[PDB]
Every structure is written in structure tokens, then in C-alpha cells.
């Protein structure tokens, strides 16, 4: 029927200069259409990742995505105090377009 | 005379649609008696004959639809490219559909046909489960204008439901795809190089089924026979877009999968090398051990050991040094 | 292979262009109108000061790069009269060389 | 130039089976060219897809949740899109934003649709 | 000018180079807006009388190896000795010339044959002359049956135009076939190169080389077609008229695509011979990594049994508590250990 | 404007004269890895080289096509009086295309001479 | 060879003979046969050892 993307942690912690990886897991297959997107507590949500591997122009190179069949993983390489918000899945294979859980990052 | 070519037979069955404007009769049967008066009604009828290998039901049905016996056969044949021929009573279309099983790495097939007959549409299957569930809900519970048109619209309907269970297929065969690039990329093993062959000929059968489909649907609308109203040729069109899509994704998928192999395969000399290593180095320390205990187990009622006390420390120490030494010229040398 | 009518896509909406490469980053137009003693090279990134070139009698150059941005596209293939499938052959990055003869 | 956003309007206090029209001025670029969808949040919850609109053929997507009682359409002389609600609930008090999408080209059958360019919220309260 | 002479032969000798005697034939096929005919026949004499006919005339001589009918179709039609030598040399490549009277074109036609994978090849000349396309071919059957059908059964432009629209069917009709042999040899490709990597023999090599030397023989002959079918078009000579060269332009676009597929295959046949070569060492590989294993396995075993297995006078270790069982359990666990540890990668 | 577009296109043209340059310094260089270090990365190097080259053809080929199409075309946009440069750079064309057909071939003997290197070492 | 006889008979000067230039040309005729003769035989030998250069290294295996 519909698509249902699931992220796991539903939330972690780390601390400035760590390296951090949420997966998302599809039910049915989505070739590359997913994208990622960060939303700061109170404020719209920001496109960082589109086609899975892709970044959007003006994010900083340190956030990077990867797809293994249908696990998709993002991952910020060395996470700075400005990139403490909830991140979120997203499919566009099909017109019914969903959206991940959403993973907070709290800071230790 | 009509053989059947395939390996399914496990059951058979038959059911009609009569759809309208206002009414439609869904009737599930289970034999031919019921779809014969099916041939002057005014409202499009969809007829569904499940299980060919009862060749009796499909010879009836052709002999009382004045279906021609070469097509019969053709409809009984199973391993046939998809073709589409223009008669002046009927258009006769044969199709592949496929389903791809997840865990397994096997792709199966399965032979489709479709006659279009005026006010009516047969079609001839092999078994029980398809991919034409939506045009069925949509004829159902009047979600669409299909109930508003005639029996043309159910072909394009069908061939429609077709195409998009290729995009399924694709779907998978794209995760398949990513899956392997990754594996063998990370480490080629053994089993991953006939995963890539399965891929490589499942992509092949895929493109020999596909590309002349896009054929027979170009010859559908490019040059409509008077069967096919002038009024569904751009619906048809729409149709041939997409297996254009098809067609080129699976170029593509193709190509990919050719690099899959070389990288590969070239590079096996390699592996003739070091397995060329392995058995020079365990041959040529352990020959002339094997040799030495020969000539010292020799036995002659005489030896240099009448007494001769520690001897075989000292023979034993010979073979350690001279394996030492063999271990340290290869060291060296770079035979290891 | 006869007539020119736009492909449909099953994934989009009938008439939507697309565009197919891998580049976001970049979109400037530099018009380049010269003639025998004067030239003007003008760098931009408003599409609505080109189209007075379209009717310029003396040579000029356009140069939009950063074709990602396909309204960019449309709006001067609306204004100068280009076919829109040419507009979705330009969108359309993985295809080989080509030419063809318009009116 | 043209510092691309979207404003949004139209989110108030309103009654279940009430009826709201969100409005969702977009400047900077043409609403004709560019795809508009709809997300909810709930208080507390993750985001939510709702509807999309391709103003430039008029065809339209709903979520499943909200399908049959929302409309979603386009108008390109105020470059504005509106989304109809009616027979609201209780469950669906949430921040509505509106986006911008672009399709981009994964391979010749798949495609992708991401959304670049959002809307500051509207409350809507049930 | 001038016809070349062969030593060996009389001087102005017109000999025919191929191969195919058996039979011999002529066809003719008038048709009009109206009426037409089919007049199949052997007396040559009778077919002369249609050179001045006001309708457009296909004749079709097949079978070649009769030089006499040759000439004298040559001389009463009033095409140069030249012509004809051309038109008697099988072996040749497309090529066209343009005389003040008639269109002189050397086309050639592919068949494929499957359990004998033999590209065998008949040269097909035509000579448009005023309202008449002459035709020789050298061989029964050709792939000119659908423009036989059109005409017969007035379906299509054909019957409405001149005799230049008729040439433009015969040649797309022979782009049409190369177009089937395409798909034939694709098919054939595809096999050959699913069997090369499973079964792979002297006889795949065979059939892989004979394959590229296909491949050879047609691109050599493409090349030439699609400057003909340039010719045609582009510089439209009178007998052509003005409205008949989009046509040519469709066939020059289609033999730009015969150009593109043959070179993508004869790129696949030049990897399918790196590919047999891989092939051919993984299987050594295979053979030798059993013949390593067992030699891994057995050879330190042989020689620490012949060292305990010697006639020295000492008695180091000949009467100990079940010396034996110890020394074959410690022997059978580093063999066990030692192939545990050839278990790793794809060796076992 | 004609001649505007000639040369855009010769422009072109040139920098593919100069990439083929930057093949050849390429191929040179890995001539001598490939017979004298035999290792797995000169296998893959010299094989997406070889696919480079196919690449290379395949556009190479329809870019000739094109102008040969505006040579021997004419179109009336062009004046007629610009169409000598136009056989210039169908020329220049034809010259890349030779060239990258023969630099395939040097790319094949290249394989060959790896897979002579690795026996000569299997049969030391 | 084939321009030496081309020369000999195309633009010949009268220090050979308008009545000799004919004879010129059966010479000049003769000179593409050997010439089509050569190539073909290349075509034939080019080939021919392909299959053994080939079929080496399938004894290896053996
Ligand atoms: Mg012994
Ligand atoms: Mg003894």
C-alpha cells in the first residue's frame, strides 16, 4: 500500500567532534529517491541530502549519505554544536511521499 | 492438432466481466459453457481463462470465436517472444509477464495473450495470481473511465497494468543491483561472481522480452487497425513512452553489469600466482626432506651409524637449518 | 520516427521538464552583444533582462549556465519560440551529440 | 535576486467539521514551474505529508489520512496555492508548511522529488 | 572508361565472379495507377519491348551467370560496358555512380544461418533508367517481397509515384533485413557470450573468431552503404525527383544506426576474447588449487612418517606408551587445523 | 551569428583535439606499469580506460555526423558563405575520430602485454 | 609500379607513340590484378593463425 520508512535510534546523543550515523529502513523498494533533511526545534526543516548520496548546495560536505539495498544511512563525520536538531527520512519513489520517524540528537 | 509447450498445470478456471455504463456482472465459472453466448453482447466483456494446458477449453473457445489455428498454436506455445498480429475479425497480442522472488535470485516468466474481438477481450493466462488486480478494482468500483469505454480501452488498460508491474520488476532488480555493486566492491567472493552471472542473465532475458514489446505497441497505435478506435490511439501512445523507459533503464542496468565482470575477471591471473606460490613452497622444502629421510631410512645392514651417538639430533637439526634456509631464500627472493 | 510529440514519463506529471544531470551549484547568464566597433559582455542572473536580445539586430552571444534551474529554460524557450521538446532535449543530459533543422 | 520564499496564511481557531483555506503566497519564482506540497506536524510528533499540486497540469497527490475531505489547487495569476480543509478533527491540530519541490533524475524509470524551499508554519488549531 | 583487361581471357570478356549457377530467371512487374501486370518469364526478348514504357517497370533478372542475358539487357537498355563489368563482379562493395541517362547502384544482401553460423552474402545491383528499375541478383530469394505485396495489392504510395519512389522502396527494404540480421546476430552474440564463460572450448573459440570476421565483413560493407545512401540524397541527381529525397534521408538516419550497432557489437565480440582467456585460467585455476590442496595436505605428513619411519640404530622413540596414536592424533590435528585454515577464501 | 556558432564549434573541436593529447600522455604512462608492474589496479586502470575509450567513440562518431550534416546540409541560417570553416572542422573531426579508434588498439595490445608479464612470472 | 604504367600511358609524351599508348594500358590492367591479388592473400594469411594464437593455453588446462 504505502511506503513506511523507520529510523533507527528514535533518538541518541553525542558530543562535538563525533562521528554519528542514523539508518532509515524502507518496507518496499525505493531505488534513490530519499532524501534527508534537519529541523532545529521550532524552525521549518532544512534539505541537506537528495538521491541518497547527493548533498544540496551550501551544506557543508561533512554531512554524507549512503544506500545499501534498501538501508539508507546518514552520516555527519565530525558533528559540530550547530547540528544538534531531528533528522528526517523521506521517500519520493511513489506520488504518496512519506516521511521517517525523526531522530533527535541531544548533546552529552 | 495442439500441443502444450509450458510446465504449468496445476489448475484452470474462467471468469467474465460484463461492464457498462451503469452495470456491470462479474461471474466466476468454471467451465466454457457459460462465456459462449459472450460474442454479440453490446457492452465490452473481458473474458479470463486460467490454466491453458486444458488445450479442449482453448480449442473451443477458438472454434467458436473463429480464432485461426496457427494462432491457437501460437497461444499454446509458451516460449515465444511477445508478437501482435492484425486480423480483420480480432487482434491477436502475446506478452510476457515476470515476477521477481526476493532471496532467491531468480527471475520467472510466464506467457499472456490477449485477443480483441469487437465488443470483447479474451484473455489466455497460466496461473492462478496476475498483475491485472488494479483494472479489475477500477472496473469494480467505477474508479476511473474505463466503465465509459469500450473494449480497446480494456487492451490499453491491460497492456497498461503490464508496463507498470515492469517498473516493479525494475524496482527490485535496482536493489538487487546496488546490493551486488556494493558486495563486490567490498570483496569479491565466489558466490557474488555467480550472483553476478544470474543478474547478468536475468538483465538478458529482460531485454530480449522487453524491446520488442515496445515494438508490438508501436505497431499498436502508430498504425491503428479499424478494431482499434482512432479515438484510444494517444492512450496507446502513452504506453510506448514507457517501455521506452524500460527498454533504457535496462540498457543501462546492462552495462553495468558487464563492468561487474571484467573487473573481476581479468584479474584472476593473480590468483594463478599465488596458488603457483603456495605449492612451490610446500614442494620444495618438503621434497628434499622426504628425500633425505629416504636415503637415512634406507635400509642396508650397513651404515656410517653403527654407534655414531646423537646422530639423529644432528640429522634432525639438518632438516631444521634446511628449512630455515629455504624459509629465508624465499623471504628474500619474494616467492611468498 | 515520425513527428515530434513530448515523451511521457510515467513518474512526473504530463507536462513537467525535468532536468537530468548531477549539477546544482551554479546558474549565471552572460550575454555577449558585439558588432564591428562596440561590444557589451553583461553578467547576470535575472532571465527577464536577455530577452531583449532575441529582436537585436546586431550578433549577440547568451550563455545560461546552470541549466538545473528549468524554469530559467522555459521561460526563454517560451519567449523565444523554441519547441519544448527541444526544451527537454536540452534538459536531457545522457543523450549523444545531435543536430536539428528548424524553421 | 528574487530571494525565493514562501508565505503562508490562513491558520486560526476553527471547529471540528469546520472548514479553512490555507494560503501559500510564493515569491520569488513561478508557481506554474515548480511542484507545491503541503506538511503537517503535530505538536510534539514528526513530519507528515499531505498533498501536492503540479499547477502546470493541474495534477494533484493527497496522503491517504487526508484524502477525500482536503483539496489542494493552484493559482498562477497570484502565484499562490490554496488547500481546502474540511470536516476537520480533533487529531489534526498541527504547524502546516508549504514547500517547493524539483524532480531530479535517479535512473530512466525511477525519479526523485526533494523539497528545497519551505514556509514558516501556520497554526492550525481544532 | 574502357573495359580493364584481364590477362588470360579474349579482350572485352565479361565473366561473372560468384558462385551461384543453379538458376536463373526474370520478372517483370508493371504497374500503374490502374492496371498492372506480372509477366514471369525466361526468353529475355520478351522483357526488352518495356524499356520505352510510359508506366514504371521493375525487372528483376536473377541469376547472374547467364553473361549473355547480361549483355544483351546492357546493350538494349544502353548501359556501358563498364556498368556491366561492375554489375558481373560479386565481389565488390556498395558504391553508386550517376550516368546522364540512369542510376547505377551495387547494393548487397545478408543471410545468416543458425547450427551453421555462415554470413553468406549476394550482391544486388540496380539500374533506374528513365521509367524502369532493372535489377540483377544471382541467387532465389530475397527481401524485396514486401514491396512485391504493396504493389500487388495497391496498398501504399508505391503505386501513385514514379519509378524513384519505387528504387527508395528497394532500398529501404534492404535496410529493413539488415535490420533483422542485427537482431539475429545480437541474439547469436548473446549466446555465444553466455557460453563462453561456462563451457569454454576450442569450438567457442572458433565460433568467436568467426564471428569478428562477420563482424568485419559488414562493417566493411556498411560503411559503404551509408555513402551511398549520402550520394542519393544529399546532391539529388535528375532521375531522382525533388520530392523523393526525405525518403533517402530516413534510409541515411537508419544506416547511421546499422553503423552504430555493428561497432557496438564488434566491441563486445573484441572483450568476449579477453573474457575466454579469464575463463579458460579460473578453470586452471580450479584444477591446480585441488592439486595444491592435496599437496599442502599430504606432503608434511609424508615426509614426518618417512622420518619416523627410518633404520637408524638408535631407539629414540620406538617403544614408548602408544608413541603411534600420539603421534597420528598431533599429525591429524594439524591437518585439520592446516585445511581449517585453507578454508578462508575460495580455495576450498 | 553563423560564424559565431563555427566558433563555438571549432572551439570545441579543439579542446577535443587536446583531450586526446591528455589520453595519449595517459596510455604512455600506463605502458610502462603494465609491463613492468603487474599488479590488479594496472588491470582495472587499463580497463575503465578502455571504457573511456568506447565512450570517447560513441560520441566522437555522432559529433562528425553533426557536422557533416551543417557541411553538405546548408540550411538557410548559415549564408553559405561560412561553410568552408564548417569543412574545416569536419576535418578536424575526422582526424579525432582515427585517432581514437587507434588509440583502442594500442589499449588491447596493452592487455595483451599484462597478460604476457603475469605468465612470464607464473612460469618463472 | 601502377603510377609508373599510369604515367606510361595517361599523359605519356610523343617519345612513346600514340600508336603504343593502347598497349600501355592492357600493361597498366594487368598491374591491379596483382595488386587486388596481394591484398586478398593478406586477407587470407592475416587470419589464419588467429585460432592457434587463440587455443594456446587450453592444453594448460589439460
Ligand atoms: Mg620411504
Ligand atoms: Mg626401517
Not at chain 4, 7 to 20: A, D, F, K, R, T
Not at chain 4, 69 to 80: E, P
Request: include cysteine; charged fraction near 25%; aromatic fraction near 12%.
Amino acid at each position: 500500500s504505502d511506503i513506511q520508512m523507520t529510523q533507527s535510534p528514535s533518538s541518541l546523543s553525542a558530543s562535538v567532534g563525533d562521528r554519528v550515523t542514523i539508518t532509515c529502513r524502507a518496507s518496499q523498494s525505493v531505488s534513490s529517491a530519499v532524501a534527508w533533511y534537519q529541523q532545529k526545534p521550532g524552525k521549518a526543516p532544512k534539505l541537506l541530502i537528495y538521491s541518497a548520496s547527493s548533498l544540496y548546495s551550501g551544506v557543508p560536505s561533512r554531512f554524507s549519505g549512503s544506500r545499501s539495498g534498501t538501508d539508507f544511512t546518514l552520516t555527519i563525520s565530525s558533528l559540530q554544536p550547530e547540528d544538534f536538531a531531528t533528522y528526517y527520512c523521506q521517500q519520493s519513489s511513489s506520488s504518496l511521499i512519506t516521511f521517517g520517524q525523526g531522530t533527535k540528537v541531544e548533546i552529552k | 492438432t495442439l500441443v502444450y509447450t509450458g510446465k504449468y498445470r496445476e489448475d484452470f478456471e474462467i471468469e467474465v466481466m460484463n461492464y457498462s455504463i451503469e452495470e456491470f456482472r462479474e461471474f466466476k465459472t468454471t467451465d466454457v459453457e457459460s462465456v459462449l453466448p459472450f460474442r454479440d453482447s453490446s457492452t465490452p466483456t473481458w473474458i479470463n481463462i486460467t490454466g491453458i494446458h486444458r488445450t479442449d477449453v482453448v480449442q473451443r473457445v477458438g472454434e467458436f470465436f473463429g480464432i485461426h489455428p496457427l494462432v491457437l498454436e501460437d497461444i499454446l506455445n509458451v516460449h515465444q517472444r511477445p508478437k501482435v498480429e492484425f486480423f480483420e475479425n480480432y487482434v491477436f497480442i502475446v506478452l510476457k509477464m515476470f515476477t521477481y522472488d526476493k532471496n532467491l535470485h531468480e527471475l520467472e516468466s510466464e506467457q499472456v495473450s490477449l485477443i480483441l474481438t469487437k465488443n470483447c477481450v479474451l484473455m489466455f493466462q497460466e496461473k492462478i495470481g496476475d498483475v491485472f488486480d488494479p483494472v479489475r478494482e477500477r472496473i469494480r468500483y467505477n474508479r476511473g473511465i474505463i466503465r465509459k469505454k469500450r473494449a480497446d480501452y480494456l487492451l490499453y488498460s491491460l497492456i497498461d497494468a503490464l508496463v507498470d508491474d515492469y517498473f516493479v520488476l525494475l524496482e527490485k532488480i535496482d536493489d538487487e543491483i546496488d546490493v551486488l555493486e556494493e558486495e563486490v566492491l567490498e570483496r569479491p567472493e565466489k558466490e557474488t561472481v555467480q550472483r553476478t552471472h544470474q543478474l547478468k542473465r536475468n538483465l538478458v532475458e529482460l531485454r530480449k522480452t522487453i524491446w520488442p514489446l515496445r515494438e508490438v505497441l508501436s505497431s499498436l497505435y502508430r498504425d491503428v487497425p479499424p478494431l482499434i478506435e482512432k479515438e484510444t490511439v494517444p492512450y496507446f501512445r502513452d504506453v510506448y513512452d514507457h517501455t521506452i523507459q524500460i527498454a533504457d533503464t535496462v540498457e543501462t542496468f546492462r552495462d553495468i553489469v558487464s563492468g561487474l565482470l571484467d573487473v573481476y575477471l581479468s584479474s584472476v591471473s593473480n590468483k594463478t600466482n599465488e596458488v603457483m606460490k603456495v605449492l612451490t613452497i610446500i614442494a620444495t622444502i618438503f621434497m628434499p626432506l622426504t628425500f633425505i629421510a629416504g636415503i637415512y631410512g634406507m635400509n642396508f645392514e650397513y651404515m656410517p651409524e653403527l654407534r655414531w651417538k646423537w646422530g639423529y639430533p644432528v640429522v634432525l637439526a639438518v632438516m631444521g637449518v634446511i628449512a630455515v634456509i629455504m624459509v629465508v631464500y624465499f623471504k628474500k627472493k619474494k616467492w611468498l | 520516427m515520425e513527428e515530434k510529440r513530448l515523451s511521457a514519463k510515467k513518474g512526473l506529471p504530463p507536462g513537467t521538464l525535468v532536468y537530468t544531470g548531477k549539477y546544482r551549484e551554479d546558474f549565471e547568464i552572460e550575454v555577449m552583444n558585439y558588432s564591428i566597433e562596440e561590444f557589451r559582455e553583461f553578467k547576470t542572473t535575472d532571465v527577464e533582462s536577455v530577452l531583449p536580445f532575441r529582436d537585436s539586430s546586431t550578433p549577440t552571444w547568451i550563455n545560461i549556465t546552470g541549466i538545473h534551474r528549468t524554469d530559467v529554460v522555459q521561460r526563454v524557450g517560451e519567449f523565444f519560440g523554441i519547441h519544448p521538446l527541444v526544451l527537454e532535449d536540452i534538459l536531457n543530459v545522457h543523450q549523444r551529440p545531435k543536430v536539428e533543422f528548424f524553421e | 535576486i528574487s530571494e525565493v520564499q514562501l508565505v503562508e496564511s490562513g491558520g486560526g481557531l476553527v471547529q471540528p467539521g469546520g472548514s479553512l483555506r490555507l494560503s501559500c503566497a510564493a515569491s520569488g519564482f513561478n508557481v506554474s514551474y515548480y511542484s507545491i506540497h503541503w506538511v503537517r506536524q503535530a505538536p510534539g510528533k514528526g513530519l507528515e505529508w499531505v498533498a501536492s499540486i503540479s499547477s502546470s497540469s493541474g495534477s494533484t497527490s493527497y496522503a491517504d489520512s487526508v484524502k477525500g475531505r482536503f483539496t489542494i489547487s493552484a493559482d498562477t495569476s497570484k502565484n499562490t496555492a490554496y488547500l481546502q480543509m474540511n470536516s476537520l478533527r480533533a487529531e489534526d491540530t498541527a504547524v502546516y508548511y508549504c514547500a517547493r519541490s524539483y524532480w531530479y533524475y535517479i535512473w530512466s524509470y525511477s525519479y526523485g522529488n526533494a523539497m528545497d524551499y519551505w514556509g514558516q508554519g501556520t497554526l492550525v488549531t481544532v
